[PDB]
Structure 1
Amino acid sequence: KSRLMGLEALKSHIMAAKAVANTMRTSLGPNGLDKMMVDKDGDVTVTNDGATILSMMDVDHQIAKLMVELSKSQDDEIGDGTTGVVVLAGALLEEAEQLLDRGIHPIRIADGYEQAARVAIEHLDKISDSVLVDIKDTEPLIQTAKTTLGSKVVNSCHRQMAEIAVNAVLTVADMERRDVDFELIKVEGKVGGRLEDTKLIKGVIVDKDFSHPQMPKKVEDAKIAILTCPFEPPKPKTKHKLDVTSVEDYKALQKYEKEKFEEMIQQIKETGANLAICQWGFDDEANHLLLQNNLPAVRWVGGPEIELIAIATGGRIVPRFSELTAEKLGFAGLVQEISFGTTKDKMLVIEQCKNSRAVTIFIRGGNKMIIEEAKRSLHDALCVIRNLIRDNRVVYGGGAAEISCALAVSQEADKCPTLEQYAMRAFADALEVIPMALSENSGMNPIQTMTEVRARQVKEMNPALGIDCLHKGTNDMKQQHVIETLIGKKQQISLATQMVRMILKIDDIRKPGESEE
């Protein structure tokens, strides 16, 4: 049994935290250098996001095993900022050794780290005023998602993507007390056409089936027949036996089923909802027969695809051919067909003005590799806007608010002068590691970088004037337009001091040979 007491604990707490904070600080900002991953299947993966990699990296230490759930809380709530919570909390951690090497007890600083987190959150209430009206604040989010798109997945900013993405959120926020749920929206991506192609779907999409162009390709009234019952013969993936008595019996059988095709028409059409969609599929033989018989039908529909159209319409599904009513049919706002991609086929877009229970941004790609990289830029852009739609609290982060609270917490070590002053000092110098790290991965000297806006804090307090990372030489945050949500930065304060609190929680560092084994 080996026990690693105190410092010997913290040396194990250094080395994994030293490793994970150093790999994040090469990845802050649009100058962030990308993270490469070989999978456990031996598969090349290149991201720049920590919450991807911390989920993908096989964690092998108590510090490292923590970071999966710690970065789970940030990305699910805030999105971007996976790197900054790791860089900050490790920088308190390595400084806490220096305090423990100074002889300062690890408990009294962990007491003071929480109070140092309080005065920083106190400062963010003064920083970066929190009133941004609904029509106007789309445009800085149009600028913010320009930053996420225009430097990482696509060099020159798909304009149609960042403007649709701010519009999908107002579709759900108004129905949901100025808040969006992330299961009422979905970032839907299907390659096949052009990478410039990007659409907003108020419901879901299914690939519309037509078997012949000689048979009429229809689209009609805003009501969908969400069916599982057969409007066309279905296929539950098996086989009967085929037997007919005569060939002329099969000649009459084609005339018999043609009346049976019209009976499936005259039952559905008298209830409404002329766009028929059935779950189990069929070949194209009786498909274009029903197209000739003047109602379109969609075949080979996925299993859960009938559910997502049901909640998007808000109505139910028709279970059986004998149970027939309109409440079990779809309640749609618009059913129109738009071509899937540019070259292959068409969809049937079922929009609703009734229920925003599945509002899906629908993008296309000319490359399979780029789209999940595009969606990952879109995953975090749809999470930061959830912060704004509740409260319009914003922050000018990226180097302005980092040096600003580092003034304040270091001042609060002097205003509140007691034992936690080195804990506040370990908090304040660690705040300077972040805009260093935005210039460290950049080509700029980060040592010069911390100097400039520090003089600006002598010039002006509560800065909308922090560093750039586009190397334009124009260091702002309101004319460089690097602006984030105040809720998101405040969440990063809570998460970083959580981890240092978490590794301090028992005094037990003994093992039976098995505490990490």
Structure 2
Amino acid sequence: KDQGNKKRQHGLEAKKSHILAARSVASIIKTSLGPRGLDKILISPDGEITITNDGATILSQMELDNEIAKLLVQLSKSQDDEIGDGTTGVVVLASALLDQALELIQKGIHPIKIANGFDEAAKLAISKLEETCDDISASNDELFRDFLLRAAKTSLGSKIVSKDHDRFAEMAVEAVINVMDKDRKDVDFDLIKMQGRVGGSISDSKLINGVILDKDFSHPQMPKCVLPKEGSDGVKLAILTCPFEPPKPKTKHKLDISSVEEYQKLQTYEQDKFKEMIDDVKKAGADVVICQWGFDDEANHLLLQNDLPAVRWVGGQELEHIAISTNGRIVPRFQDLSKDKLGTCSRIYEQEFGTTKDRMLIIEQSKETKTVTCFVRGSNKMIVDEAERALHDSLCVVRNLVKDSRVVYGGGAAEVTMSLAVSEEADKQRGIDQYAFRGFAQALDTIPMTLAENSGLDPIGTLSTLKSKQLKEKISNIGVDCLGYGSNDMKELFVVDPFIGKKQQILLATQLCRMILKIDNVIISGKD
């Protein structure tokens, strides 16, 4: 079917083309690896020009028909959810395993043996890093927080945000503690609302313990703050998934007003129907009415005299963050409204942010919730977008630091340690696996050499220097300098990477490398 404009490669030209196709795509982000990596000018299909060095943003904007390069995109979707820092590093590491696999294919090595060769070599590298890793919480409690404060500083060190970075460092520590419990040790991104707007500065960003839900308070006469109402417990809010309207059948409608006589009849008719539905709010004792649909003019008049601020046009997902922070429930209809399902919070007020005329509102708690909302501002639209993604990566590092106390020192010291460990174990394991372990260690050298290239240094001369300091002297962690520093030995400069984070990166690199080798056949049809 559709023999024209149809290409197929099996067992001959596919093995050579799959390696060169992924090599040309991975070579794009090699220069962007590390904080010193170089930016790129990206153009959206709508015509917007953006500039960022993040590998995830660059790879996500790629829409391509290359069958092998799609496997790099499918993994990148899981990289942001699992880790988020394994975007550029794994793709370069996965392509390094492919370049070493192509050299073995030319030698007559079976591709599945290469897949099993990298799998057994990855398991040996985990055991070596497990012995040489160090503990944080065992060193001190405040030194752990010092790593969290400097974890966001590393991601923000390459951006203008680095001036005020001390503000966002504390926002990442207080947010993870609330949304994550030390039992499961998991930070759900769906429980963290990321919202930002253009204008102001980066120092005006505040950390809110609950949903923001910007609203104009409907009618302007309604008050800007919600009072406890004479010793009542917290502040009760109403979550309604049904619109507030006078009851009407499904058949006719067609309401015609001939004169003022019929105008006063319909006005008092709809007002009396509003008095029946507001009683359910009064019986439940809800201070503010939050609904998914808009309100009428007479609807806000009765809510104004009763001191009941009105909130209309709230999205479905926005109502989900309300019940989680305030420990409320989703009430489907008006007859099911009860005081037990009302969200309880500390207060609701309107806080002016800088010179912005939006004048958003803040709903606080003062108690530990199951969700938080990160609020970010900046003087430029790019600064806001870069600060949201850098904060997202900072929240993921903190998740891995608490989940696993063991960590490794990055900056090239981890990859060189993995190479010297596998190369030593390569001679201990004889047979075909000997060459499979040597090729795996040579592929691990791509990351520190790429970081050496991206640092403006000789990749070959620097790689031999790190191997000389970790052997003739003693076994330790000394990496390449990505950003200009005082000297080498990252262990002295306190550059830390999560062990479970680096372990997740090396597994996804070998997982995708196998799937690339497990597919020797590519069949694509034409474009009708």
Question: Which TM-score tier does this pair reach, normalised by the shorter chain?
Answer: 0.7 to 0.9
Matched, 1:442 2:455: yes
Note if contact 2:470-2:478 (Cα within 8 Å) is conserved in structure 1.
no
Q: Helix, strand or coil for the counterpart of 1:226? A: strand
* Superimposed CA distance per residue, residues 352-373 of structure 1 (whole angstroms, 9 cap, x where no aligned partner): 4667343221222333232222
**C-alpha separation in 2, matches of 1:419 and 1:96:** 14
In structure 1, distance between residues paired with 2:17 and 2:119: 23
Matched, 1:487 2:503: no
Change (3 A) 1:213 1:44: closer
Equivalences for residues 70-85 of structure 1 within 5 A: 70-85=75-90
- Matched residue of 2:134: which SS? coil
What is the one-letter code of the residue matched to 1:22?
Answer: S
Q: Give the match for residue 192 of structure 2.
A: 185
1:7-51 Cα shifts (integer Å, max 9, x gaps)? 632220122121122122111111111243333445434332223
Distance 1:333 1:178, change over 3 A: farther
Alpha-carbon distance in structure 2 between the residues aligned to 1:327 and 1:462: 61
**1:282-321 alignment runs, 5 A limit:** 282=295, 287=300, 290-291=303-304, 293-321=306-334
> TM-score scaled by structure 1?
0.86
Supply the distance in 1 between the matched residues of 2:114 and 2:448 (Cα, whole angstroms): 24
User: Structure 2: how far apart are the matches of 1:269 and 1:433?
Assistant: 67
The Cα shift of 1:256 comes to 9.6
Q: Name stretches of at least 5 consecutive residues in structure 2 with no aligned partner.
A: 229-233
Q: Which residue of 1 aligns with 2:396?
A: 383
Q: Would you say 1:502 and 2:522 are equivalent positions? A: no
The alignment partner of 1:304 has SS state of: helix
Correspondence 1:418 to 2:425: no
Larger deviation: 408-417 or 211-220?
211-220
Deviations 1:164-221 (A, max 9, x none): 1222111122276332222222323233443322222222112243468776433223
Checking the alignment, whether the CA contact within 8 Å between 1:28 and 1:438 is kept in structure 2 is yes
**C-alpha distance 292-83 of structure 1, shift in aligned 2 (>3 A):** same
Q: Secondary structure at the match of 1:11?
A: helix
- Cα deviation digits, residues 215-236 of structure 1 (max 9, x gap): 6433223323224389986999
- Higher mean displacement: 96-105 or 374-383: 96-105
The superposition leaves residues 456-503 of structure 1 with CA deviations (integer Å, 9 ceiling, x where unpaired) of: 212555534322211224223233332111111111211122222212
For 1:12, which of 17, 34, 44 is the aligned residue?
Answer: 17
Deviation, structure 1 residue 424? 1.4
Verify the 8 A CA contact 1:116 1:409 in the aligned structure 2: yes
Deviations 1:440-459 (A, max 9, x none): 12333333432332222125
How many Å separate the matches in 2 of 1:390 and 1:297? 42
- 1:307-330, Cα deviation, whole Å (9 max, x unpaired): 321233222244555554202311
**Aligned match for 1:243, one of 257, 269, 292:** 257
Shift in Å at residue 66 of structure 1?
0.9
* One of 44, 69, 72 as aligned partner of 1:67: 72
Taking a change above 3 Å as real, the CA distance of residues 105 and 157 of structure 1, as seen in their structure-2 partners, is: farther
Count of residues in Structure 1 that have an aligned counterpart in Structure 2: 512
Equivalent in 224, 228, 235 of residue 223 of structure 1: 235
Quote the Cα distance in structure 2 between the aligned partners of 1:188 and 1:284: 30
| Contact map agreement 1:201 1:362 (CA 8 A) in 2 | yes
Q: Among residues 412, 418, 424, which one is paired with 1:405 in the alignment?
A: 418
Seen in structure 2, the aligned counterparts of structure 1 residues 175 and 245 have a Cα distance that, compared at 3 Å, is: farther
Sort the Cα spacing of 1:470 and 1:516 in 2 relative to 1 into closer, same or farther, 3 A.
Answer: farther
Name the CA shift for 1:278/1:175 in 2 (closer, same or farther; >3 Å): farther
Q: What per-residue deviation string (whole Å, max 9, x for no partner) do you get for residues 119-176 of structure 1?
A: 1111110233134266542321221111112314635353222221222111122276
Structure 1 residue matching 2:240: 3-state secondary structure: coil
Determine the structure 2 residue equivalent to 1:277.
Answer: 290
Map of 1:102-501 to 2, 5 A cutoff? 102-132=107-137, 136-152=143-159, 154-174=161-181, 177-210=184-217, 216-221=223-228, 222-228=234-240, 241=255, 243=257, 245-246=259-260, 250=264, 268-269=281-282, 271-282=284-295, 287=300, 290-291=303-304, 293-340=306-353, 342-352=355-365, 356-501=369-514
Q: Kindly indicate whether the alpha-carbon contact (under 8 Å) linking 1:39 and 1:56 is maintained by their aligned counterparts in 2.
A: yes
Q: Aligned with 1:79: secondary structure?
A: coil
Q: Measure, in 2, the Cα distance between the counterparts of 1:232 and 1:167.
A: 38
Q: 1:91 deviation in Å?
A: 1.8
| CA distance 1:125–1:229, change in 2 (3 Å) | closer
Partner residue in 1 for 2:231: none
CA shift for structure 1 position 381? 1.8
2:225–2:349 CA contact under 8 A, matched in 1? no
SS at match of 1:207: coil
Distance 1:174 1:446, change over 3 A: same
Q: Which amino acid aligns with 1:365?
A: G
The CA distance in 2 between the partners of 1:467 and 1:271, in whole Å, is 63
Percent of residue pairs identical = 57
Match of 1:39? 44
Q: Which runs of 5+ in 1 are unaligned?
A: none
Superposition deviation, residue 340 in structure 1: 4.6
Secondary structure, counterpart of 2:479 in structure 1: coil
Tell me the amino acid that sits aligned with residue 217 of structure 1: K
The Cα shift of 1:395 comes to 1.7
Please tell me whether the aligned partners of residues 194 and 366 of structure 1 are also in contact (alpha carbons under 8 angstroms): yes
SS for the counterpart of 2:400 is helix
Secondary structure at the aligned position of 1:411 is classed as: helix
Could you state the TM-score of these two structures normalised by the residue count of structure 2? Answer: 0.84
In 1, Cα distance between the equivalents of 2:442 and 2:329?
Answer: 58
Quick one: which of 85, 100, 105 aligns to 2:105? 100
- Give 1:249 shift: 7.6
1:61, 1:516 within 8 Å by CA — same for their partners in 2? no
Decide whether the 8 Å contact of 1:404 with 1:461 is kept in 2: no
Alignment root-mean-square deviation, CA: 3.6
Distance across 1 between alignment mates of 2:92 and 2:472: 28
Q: Which moved more, 1:404-413 or 1:54-63?
A: 54-63
